[PDB]
Amino acid sequence: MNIFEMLRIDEGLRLKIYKDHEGYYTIGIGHLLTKSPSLNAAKSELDKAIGRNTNGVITKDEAEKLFNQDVDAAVRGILRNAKLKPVYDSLDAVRRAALINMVFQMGETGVAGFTNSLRMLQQKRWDEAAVNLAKSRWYNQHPNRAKRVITTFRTGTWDAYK
Numbered sequence: 450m451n452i453f454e455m456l457r458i459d460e461g462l463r464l465k466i467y468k469d470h471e472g473y474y475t476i477g478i479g480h481l482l483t484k485s486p487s488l489n490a491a492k493s494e495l496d497k498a499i500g501r502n503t504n505g506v507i508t509k510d511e512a513e514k515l516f517n518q519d520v521d522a523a524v525r526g527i528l529r530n531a532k533l534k535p536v537y538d539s540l541d542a543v544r545r546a547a548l549i550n551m552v553f554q555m556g557e558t559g560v561a562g563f564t565n566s567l568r569m570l571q572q573k574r575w576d577e578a579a580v581n582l583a584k585s586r587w588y589n590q591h592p593n594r595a596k597r598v599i600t601t602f603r604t605g606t607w608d609a610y611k
């Protein structure tokens with residue numbers, strides 16, 4: 450298992466524009482287009498990203514390309530951030546994926562605000578970190594996914610994804 454498979458499982462794949470659980474326009478594999486209510490606005494962002502006139506519809510290859518870029522970006526976000534990098538660096542391969550999963554979903558900045566969990570992860574206090582992570586809007590708004598990620602951090606295995 451690896452980061453791509455992981456997130457592909459967590460985000461699903463949709464080739465047509467859609468409103469996510471928060472009402473934001475998205476597409477592909479968890480690619481947020483815009484927080485704006487205008488579908489035209491989302492259509493324009495999509496066309497700009499793809500480089501063609503899409504009509505709100507994309508191909509699988511295209512969706513995978515957006516995903517690769519998005520995965521690349523999450524990683525760079527982690528490496529650039531003074532708070533994330535040291536944690537990332539301290540972790541093992543499986544857990545790094547869990548970290549990437551979160552940065553992908555909520556951005557460098559959202560993850561960097563989980564101060565206490567970050568610190569516990571850095572100390573390898575798995576059970577405490579998992580309890581701390583669960584106290585969040587993140588968890589309450591994405592119960593199933595959040596449990597899979599927290600479980601990964603807790604265990605250091607891909608068991609949650611089998």
Ligand SMILES: [Cl-]
Pocket residue numbers: 498
């Ligand atoms: Cl883009």
Ligand SMILES: [Cl-]
Pocket residue numbers: 590591592593594595
């Ligand atoms: Cl969920």
Ligand code: NI
Pocket residue numbers: 450451
């Ligand atoms: Ni595998």
Ligand code: NI
Pocket residue numbers: 470471590591
């Ligand atoms: Ni969400």
